[PDB]
Amino acid sequence: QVQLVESGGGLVQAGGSLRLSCAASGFPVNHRTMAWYRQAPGKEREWVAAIESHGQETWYADSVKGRFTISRDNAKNTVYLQMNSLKPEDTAVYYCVRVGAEYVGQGTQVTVSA
Amino acid sequence: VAVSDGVIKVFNDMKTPEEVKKRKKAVLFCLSEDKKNIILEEGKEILVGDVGQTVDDPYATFVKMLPDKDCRYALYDATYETKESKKEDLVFIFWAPESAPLKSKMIYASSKDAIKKKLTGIKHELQANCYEEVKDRCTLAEKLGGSAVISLEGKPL
């Protein structure tokens, strides 16, 4: 029943902007702690942004502070990651997950060309 | 976040009658004060020798030790049965309740991969974000051996 469907990735020029979306079903995004992490091939996952359940307190990794914003639309049951000032080091597959739950979607590829 | 020696030792121990009574049945791990290390949480364990003496239902006692508003890791040594076999396996548990503060919760969430890599040979993981999930014996049973598991921790499912 639970689905986490990321989209919005693509190839972007360094310095550009992109907005990722995760369309969720089977649970309400405003009742879970939703987080974005990214994974480059052969590397460990890097958690980059999260938004708490009920309230909207946010958390950001130091590597994306000042450049990324996480948000959600409760009515659309969707979580977003607004990215600005993208860098080659941001190239990765991006995943949107529930903290404390096992299941993960397929992610969306972001590629930033120098 | 570093993993303390103690966590490394306890895992390897869990992988004479008096010595057997000192083996861990369950153990909780938490962040150190400076949030730079994952350490044993003092006193938050069940020993094999506790069971039948001060502990009657170790899984229920384990759940009672989970904090309402903070995250934890844990190892639980679970016994379970299918129709044809009786098995015992370690389960790595990540406890992340919704009302835990986001800042340290994200440290726990982002550090889970690093601690699990220290627990070489760990075969099963249960993540939970509320008590209804962590108390779901059917869910633990399914994380352990799927739909073939019919009893768990000495009780029928």
UniProtKB/Swiss-Prot annotation, chain B:
<dbReference type="GO" id="GO:0015629">
    <property type="term" value="C:actin cytoskeleton"/>
</dbReference>
<feature type="modified residue" description="Phosphotyrosine">
    <location>
        <position position="73"/>
    </location>
</feature>
<dbReference type="GO" id="GO:0030036">
    <property type="term" value="P:actin cytoskeleton organization"/>
</dbReference>
<dbReference type="GO" id="GO:0040019">
    <property type="term" value="P:positive regulation of embryonic development"/>
</dbReference>
<comment type="similarity">
    <text>Belongs to the actin-binding proteins ADF family.</text>
</comment>
<feature type="modified residue" description="N6-acetyllysine">
    <location>
        <position position="135"/>
    </location>
</feature>
<dbReference type="GO" id="GO:0051014">
    <property type="term" value="P:actin filament severing"/>
</dbReference>
<feature type="cross-link" description="Glycyl lysine isopeptide (Lys-Gly) (interchain with G-Cter in SUMO2)">
    <location>
        <position position="123"/>
    </location>
</feature>
<dbReference type="GO" id="GO:0097060">
    <property type="term" value="C:synaptic membrane"/>
</dbReference>
<dbReference type="GO" id="GO:0071364">
    <property type="term" value="P:cellular response to epidermal growth factor stimulus"/>
</dbReference>
<dbReference type="GO" id="GO:1905875">
    <property type="term" value="P:negative regulation of postsynaptic density organization"/>
</dbReference>
<dbReference type="GO" id="GO:0070062">
    <property type="term" value="C:extracellular exosome"/>
</dbReference>
<dbReference type="GO" id="GO:0030010">
    <property type="term" value="P:establishment of cell polarity"/>
</dbReference>
<keyword id="KW-0007">Acetylation</keyword>
<dbReference type="GO" id="GO:0044794">
    <property type="term" value="P:positive regulation by host of viral process"/>
</dbReference>
<dbReference type="GO" id="GO:0007266">
    <property type="term" value="P:Rho protein signal transduction"/>
</dbReference>
<keyword id="KW-0963">Cytoplasm</keyword>
<keyword id="KW-0009">Actin-binding</keyword>
<feature type="modified residue" description="Phosphotyrosine">
    <location>
        <position position="59"/>
    </location>
</feature>
<dbReference type="GO" id="GO:0030043">
    <property type="term" value="P:actin filament fragmentation"/>
</dbReference>
<dbReference type="GO" id="GO:1990314">
    <property type="term" value="P:cellular response to insulin-like growth factor stimulus"/>
</dbReference>
<dbReference type="GO" id="GO:0051015">
    <property type="term" value="F:actin filament binding"/>
</dbReference>
<dbReference type="GO" id="GO:0071362">
    <property type="term" value="P:cellular response to ether"/>
</dbReference>
<dbReference type="GO" id="GO:0043066">
    <property type="term" value="P:negative regulation of apoptotic process"/>
</dbReference>
<feature type="modified residue" description="Phosphoserine">
    <location>
        <position position="32"/>
    </location>
</feature>
<dbReference type="GO" id="GO:0045862">
    <property type="term" value="P:positive regulation of proteolysis"/>
</dbReference>
<dbReference type="GO" id="GO:0030835">
    <property type="term" value="P:negative regulation of actin filament depolymerization"/>
</dbReference>
<dbReference type="GO" id="GO:0030027">
    <property type="term" value="C:lamellipodium"/>
</dbReference>
<dbReference type="GO" id="GO:0016363">
    <property type="term" value="C:nuclear matrix"/>
</dbReference>
<dbReference type="GO" id="GO:0016020">
    <property type="term" value="C:membrane"/>
</dbReference>
<dbReference type="GO" id="GO:0031966">
    <property type="term" value="C:mitochondrial membrane"/>
</dbReference>
<dbReference type="GO" id="GO:0099092">
    <property type="term" value="C:postsynaptic density, intracellular component"/>
</dbReference>
<dbReference type="GO" id="GO:0070301">
    <property type="term" value="P:cellular response to hydrogen peroxide"/>
</dbReference>
<dbReference type="GO" id="GO:0005634">
    <property type="term" value="C:nucleus"/>
</dbReference>
<dbReference type="GO" id="GO:0005911">
    <property type="term" value="C:cell-cell junction"/>
</dbReference>
<dbReference type="GO" id="GO:2000814">
    <property type="term" value="P:positive regulation of barbed-end actin filament capping"/>
</dbReference>
<dbReference type="GO" id="GO:0032232">
    <property type="term" value="P:negative regulation of actin filament bundle assembly"/>
</dbReference>
<dbReference type="InterPro" id="IPR017904">
    <property type="entry name" value="ADF/Cofilin"/>
</dbReference>
<feature type="modified residue" description="Phosphoserine">
    <location>
        <position position="99"/>
    </location>
</feature>
<dbReference type="GO" id="GO:0043025">
    <property type="term" value="C:neuronal cell body"/>
</dbReference>
<keyword id="KW-0945">Host-virus interaction</keyword>
<dbReference type="GO" id="GO:0007162">
    <property type="term" value="P:negative regulation of cell adhesion"/>
</dbReference>
